[PDB]
Structure 1
């Protein structure tokens, strides 16, 4: 009955509800272009659901030795993020009709973010934890650079409802993604300052907002209709 359980339970509920709602809504859409966004965006909280549920049940948790202590690390988060973060970038890329090469590069930079963040979460040499964290944060900053300079630029050729929706999602994304590396740095994977219960509450708010909040905004806009 670990104290962070409550936040995993509430994350499981919120992700489950969001998945359902988005499914119900997506089932009623016939527009070809809109259906693709629904599929992708319903899949995202679905995957987060399974991983929050897993973590609630005590899977995806391992102890890593570093700084003279056994430290609890939820690796299940990375299995979620490995698929969900590129799917959220895909939403944004299809919105602004980004080029296939840009999408490859993003997904590739995202895989590297997640994978190097994983390696760092599992690293036993304390200082090497932060080498992997820095490389991960670099890859995240490449992504955000691309969203902000590349996509915004592209979105500016599009219809106003597309440009407006993109900007909102881009802003939500940059604010919430940028908070992840900070939480990791001060939390249990990092400096150990913020306790695991509070850290789990923080990832909860950020994940729900970055998937369900993002989703509500995207799927209720007129921008997804071709």
Structure 2
């Protein structure tokens, strides 16, 4: 799966760029007070575009490791929560959640990286997973409660935003745990790549759809 993994990096790079340019162009189709999440979403795909180029160059040099993705994640995961809050909150409530959810997301990714950079199945490996998993659940529970105030088309549009994250992000912990049950190292990189594309481009598209409802 070496050639597939490398070819998927290039596919992701084009995919992230495609998402970046699509969101930047479509940003004026929504009213200015609803554009911030669209801009953030494009920034998200653009950072991922930048990193997937870096990871492909790393793979050609023969020096890649799974820890290279974490540089991406530590920036974009907090920004993805921000692009969701950008469309669901305002004022003091927005500032508090951005801080709190962004701290939690950073802790989740850092704890993951701690466990990632040790032997599969070591104590550091399990320590990282438990801390990251706890922050993951806290985040998903907070995301579920976020829709509890919406109504009408906004609730429908937010349900799609919520469900993409709830469903699409499961692959990340699953991929982390799999190498302790079998030889899943190669497939973990293939699936993370595909998932990053769906999750970043897809979330941007759904945030844009939500900004469309808010402007219409």
**Normalising to structure 1: TM-score of the pair?**
0.83
* Structure (1 or 2) with the greater strand fraction: 1
Counterpart position of 2:8: 7
User: Which one has more relative contact order, counting CA pairs under 8 Å at least 6 apart?
Assistant: 2
Distance across 2 between alignment mates of 1:212 and 1:225: 21
The corresponding residue for 1:146 is 142
Q: Which moved more, 1:206-215 or 1:29-38?
A: 29-38
Q: Is this contact kept in 2: 1:22–1:38, CA < 8 A?
A: yes
Aligned counterpart, 1:112 = 107
Higher helix share: 2
Is 1:209 paired with 2:205?
no
Does 1:102 find its partner at 2:103? no
Give CA deviations for 1:39-66 in whole Å, capped at 9, x if unaligned: 101001001111111000017x998xxx
Compared CA separation, residues 29 and 19, structure 1 to 2 (3 A) = same
1:62, 1:78 → 2: CA distance?
A: 18
The residue aligned with 1:134 is 130
Cross-structure match for 2:167: 175
The two structures, once aligned, show a CA RMSD in angstroms of 2.4
Aligned residues: 209
State the 1:161 CA deviation: 2.0
Query: Which consecutive unaligned segments of at least 5 residues does structure 1 have?
Result: 64-71
Does the CA-based 8 Å contact 1:95-1:162 persist in structure 2? Answer: no
Residues 214 and 126 of structure 1: is their aligned pair in 2 closer, same or farther, counting only changes over 3 Å?
same
Contact map agreement 2:164 2:199 (CA 8 A) in 1: yes
**2:35 pairs with 1:46:** no
Q: Contact 2:36–2:86 at 8 Å: present in 1 too?
A: no
Structure 2 unmatched ranges of 5 or more: none
Q: Distance in 2 between matches of 1:39 and 1:7?
A: 26
